Amino acid sequence: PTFYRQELNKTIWEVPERYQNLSPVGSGAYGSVCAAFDTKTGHRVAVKKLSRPFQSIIHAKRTYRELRLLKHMKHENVIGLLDVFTPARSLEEFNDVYLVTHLMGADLNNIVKCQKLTDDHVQFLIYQILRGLKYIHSADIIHRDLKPSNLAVNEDSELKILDFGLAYVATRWYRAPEIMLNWMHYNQTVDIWSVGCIMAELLTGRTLFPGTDHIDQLKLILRLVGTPGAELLKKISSESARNYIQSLAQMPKMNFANVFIGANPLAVDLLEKMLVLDSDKRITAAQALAHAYFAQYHDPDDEPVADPYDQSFESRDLLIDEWKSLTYDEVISFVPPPLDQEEME
Numbered sequence: 001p002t003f004y005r006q007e008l009n010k011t012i013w014e015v016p017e018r019y020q021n022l023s024p025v026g027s028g029a030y031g032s033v034c035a036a037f038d039t040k041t042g043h044r045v046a047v048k049k050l051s052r053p054f055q056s057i058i059h060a061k062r063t064y065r066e067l068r069l070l071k072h073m074k075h076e077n078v079i080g081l082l083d084v085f086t087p088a089r090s091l092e093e094f095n096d097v098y099l100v101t102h103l104m105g106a107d108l109n110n111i112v113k114c115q116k117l118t119d120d121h122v123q124f125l126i127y128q129i130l131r132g133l134k135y136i137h138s139a140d141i142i143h144r145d146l147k148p149s150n151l152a153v154n155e156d157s158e159l160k161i162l163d164f165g166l167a168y169v170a171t172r173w174y175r176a177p178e179i180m181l182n183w184m185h186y187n188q189t190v191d192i193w194s195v196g197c198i199m200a201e202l203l204t205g206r207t208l209f210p211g212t213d214h215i216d217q218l219k220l221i222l223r224l225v226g227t228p229g230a231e232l233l234k235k236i237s238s239e240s241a242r243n244y245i246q247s248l249a250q251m252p253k254m255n256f257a258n259v260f261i262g263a264n265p266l267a268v269d270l271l272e273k274m275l276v277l278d279s280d281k282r283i284t285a286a287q288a289l290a291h292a293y294f295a296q297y298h299d300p301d302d303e304p305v306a307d308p309y310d311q312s313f314e315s316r317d318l319l320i321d322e323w324k325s326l327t328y329d330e331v332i333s334f335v336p337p338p339l340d341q342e343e344m345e
């Protein structure tokens with residue numbers, strides 16, 4: 001294929017003639033993104049150029065990690081790959097990686113709406129997040145930083161999770177307490193806390209826990225969910241942190257029906273099951289999909305799990321050129337999916 005060069009975001013992109021009319025649509029993890037027209041299929045796509053993918057061992061392994069992850073993800077509510085390309089003609093020339101996915105116009109902060117979101121629409125948005133989470137969690141992949149800006153949404157409110165399984169001032173307002181505070185253990189339900197925070201905000205229009213720092217955020221959290229028991233202190237290594245939490249005046253759990261006034265009682269019930277400090281008591285994604293709040297959308301035949309995902313590479317320290325060669329192998333071996341991968345139920 002013939003490549004052309006175009007300066008976008010103050011740097012040269014080199015892309016196949018197949019992709020036309022590139023225009024910038026923001027930064028992504030470790031890269032920047034342009035919308036484009038795929039002349040082969042007439043579809044709109046998003047192309048991410050990775051930033052300095054082989055600058056160091058940190059960049060090189062994260063490049064491999066992201067390409068391996070996205071090549072594995074085949075779910076309608078999870079970002080996956082239509083294409084991956086490089087202008088390089090050989091490994092010796094290889095220094096740039098571009099990832100292609102279906103174009104999604106917005107993020108959840110941008111969701112098209114008429115004054116306020118109906119409950120039916122909130123159900124659909126949260127349902128899709130949970131369906132995507134069930135899939136990634138089934139491959140032992142956790143997001144860890146799920147938030148509205150990591151949910152890509154199109155013009156028909158179809159949603160995909162992105163920037164999962166990876167790793168500028170980020171918002172911490174949606175992070176699970178065990179993540180924000182570096183507790184010693186956690187599980188996949190860190191992401192369910194984030195879903196609760198997102199859903200709460202879709203129902204009220206206001207951030208659930210808009211803390212100014214981690215201590216302020218923890219205090220806002222404890223006002224809703226109540227003071228934790230001593231069992232939770234087991235999870236916290238720092239004595240000063242444990243002493244602080246233990247020293248706080250006791251607070252009762254709030255009745256969520258008094259917080260989310262006028263909400264669907266099923267929405268309130270689901271929030272009570274997600275916004276639990278005890279991550280071992282938190283509802284899982286698969287359990288949440290069966291909750292009556294989603295009754296009009298739930299379809300067990302269309303809530304699939306993932307194929308097994310081999311992450312053994314994560315424990316390995318390899319040289320930069322080894323990560324680079326492995327990444328090149330993954331570029332060259334990529335098989336584009338069929339354009340139409342779905343059938344009537």
Ligand SMILES: Nc1nccc(-c2c(-c3ccc(F)cc3)ncn2C2CCNCC2)n1
Binds near residue numbers: 026099103
């Ligand atoms: N508009 C759009 N549509 C789909 C995805 C993205 C995208 C990607 C991305 C990931 C993988 C890939 F192969 C191609 C693109 N990374 C960040 N974003 C956007 C997510 C919403 N805020 C702007 C950046 N952007």
Ligand SMILES: NS(=O)(=O)c1ccc(N2C(=O)CCC2=O)nc1
Binds near residue numbers: 204206259260261262
């Ligand atoms: N935080 S609040 O008191 O401003 C507030 C705002 C909005 C709401 N709410 C509605 O109106 C419908 C569902 C819902 O949760 N509840 C509380």
Ligand SMILES: N[C@@]12C[C@H]3C[C@@H](C1)C[C@](O)(C3)C2
Binds near residue numbers: 207209210220221224
């Ligand atoms: N946004 C909130 C939700 C709960 C009631 C009120 C407003 C105090 C708070 O700490 C808990 C934060």
Ligand SMILES: [Ca+2]
Binds near residue numbers: 299302345
């Ligand atoms: Ca169906």
Ligand SMILES: [Ca+2]
Binds near residue numbers: 340344
């Ligand atoms: Ca079809």
Ligand SMILES: [Ca+2]
């Ligand atoms: Ca479709």
Ligand SMILES: [Ca+2]
Binds near residue numbers: 301345
């Ligand atoms: Ca069926």
